[model samples]
Target: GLVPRGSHMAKLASLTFKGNESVSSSTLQEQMELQPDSWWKLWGNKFEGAQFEKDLQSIRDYYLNNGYAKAQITKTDVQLNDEKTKVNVTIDVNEGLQYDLRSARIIGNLGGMSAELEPLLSALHLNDTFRRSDIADVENAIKAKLGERGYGSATVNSVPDFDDANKTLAITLVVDAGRRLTVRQLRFEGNTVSADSTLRQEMRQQEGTWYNSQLVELGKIRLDRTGFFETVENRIDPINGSNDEVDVVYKVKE
Candidate 1:
């Protein structure tokens, strides 16, 4: 087999930090790699090399903000190892400077939604404080606000958009309202045990109703709560007649 030209497995090498005093080995391990069993599977099929380094930097920034000021990360050369296909990673810590949020800005299409979000921004109150926990709290608050407004599946990403001329850090929150995909059909892959109507009642979204992300998620939650199926997958298949409607196929693992 050619193994495909674009498919080279990416494995973790090492993560190093300079100034962190509180980062645990296990915590670092979890951040450097995805869940052990899924790590290789997730990264293996993607393009390797520089892309891997970009992902590593993103992970490094995560650790840096989590009280690790100076972190040095090194990844194993997977090209040389094959016995266990293990990629060794090392992290050097230098917890340098703990930076505080001087100010924060909510830019983009907030429109009339700003009034609802002002209180949340005030509660964050970044001017006089600096803590890793506060940053996470603020991030969650933004997402919670969006999720409450029927944009349950909306994505909010906050990144530092620095101004070099002014020498200041400004946070930019980008919100993307994903397609409001609704369920038009619910099909079961394998259902030899129960009647179709019986399983239909188990689903939260109906064939004739508009697709609701919350309802679909709720259905998944309820199914898992029942402890009947070993695995359950909800797939969104777009309808041929309309863009708004999608056929949801729930694949069960027996």
Candidate 2:
């Protein structure tokens, strides 16, 4: 599909960079992720139509993520080489105002985790350059902390409210910390030969135990090491009409 209009292979002879006056071409060249739909790393570098479509936005986002909030790719021009087997590329970009951080706030139910989350909220700094990836990093760290406390699916959202006039953003971390899920019941599947009570003896996780991910994994390892089954897979399902109760199913294959 990327053979070009008529040629068997289309190679990139040259590419022209324009409109990124604030940043050097070498700096912009180092920004692309270098992913192609056809796995170009192993194969020869042919003109990838899929990569061309995504590369434009990637270039724009590179500048935007680097604080150029109004960055724009005005045009992309592809010209045929003299041999017609290769092509020349040209891109025009407009990197506008760079957005900075005005303020950062944590806004959600922090009542139970006020002491534990104080340090994370304190990491936010004002008068700094705004970065989308940094916001994501902060959000993930907060969610992982919640996970350590058995909050399996704690939702954390970072919303940046940009102030255009001042060229800065007021970011808010919105959190929806779900209830601490726990193991309420244990069940077995694919075990036609093993007894239910016998299987229960191999499990470290039991009913009324606060669900910890590592503990559940260890229970599966214990069941497999017993030599009663060839393989063991663990699955979980929430009990109907319950927020914190979950059923652990030990799927055996023998």
Candidate 3:
């Protein structure tokens, strides 16, 4: 048997981040999965080799997505105490050059909504650092806008072109607006406590009209706000063998 079972499972004593100044150590730690646990804690966090490796990738991604395109994990050191029961970790990072957005555009089947949707892309201002989160927000806003305009099956994809010499990035949004689907029926499920007419009065997406995803989502919010149900949900399913009609189902819990 081992000399002692306690020494076999080492507890993490400290975690330190070195060679990073643009972002604070505490903020970087927030991006890492492996955290420090004090030795005095009754149930300290144990050091896991797999988790340590994953944390390195997390740190790398955090910087890369936040404008440090050439960020690298220079080194990492793991040390154990004399008792061999407590571990200390040190991570060295090199946050290299930063990249900013130079130009961005939206293209593809906008169905004549380009004038209205173009303003949404301005969230990612030119010359600003290329932020992945901001790109996601723009994408979601475009989708929401299309959904409101009867483009229920629309898709948006952002293509990024990085220019290393200029330290700038160009983003192109490729959209695919599928066929418009009208609302054939609005049904309710799991709503034993609420009457059908009561729920129908709350919906903004009416039958015989185009399916509006934003309206359906707003309808759910309105129902939730009524305080008449414990929970509210909505589902849209294409009608059998029909390409241009769908049934909207709202599920509620009392």
What overall lDDT goes with each candidate model? 0.56, 0.72, 0.81
lDDT per residue for candidate 1 within 56-139, as digits (tens), equals: 665577655653333455333333246435454344554444444556656555424577765665655453433445656666
For model 2, residues 71-121, the per-residue Cα lDDT tens digits are: 888888766555545566787888877889787777786537756765786
Model 2 residue 217 distance off true place after TM-score fit, in angstroms: 12
List candidate 1 segments past 4 Å from native: 1-97, 101-153, 162-170, 189-192, 231-235, 238-243, 249-254
Candidate 2 Cα misplacement greater than 4 A, ranges: 1-8, 33-61, 72-84, 109-111, 182-254
In the range 75-184, model 3's lDDT, one tens digit per residue, is 99888777757778899998866899888899999967899889997787689887766887888888778888788878889887889888998889998777787998
Q: Could you tell me the lDDT of residue 204 within candidate 3?
A: 89
RMSD to native, candidate 1: 7.0
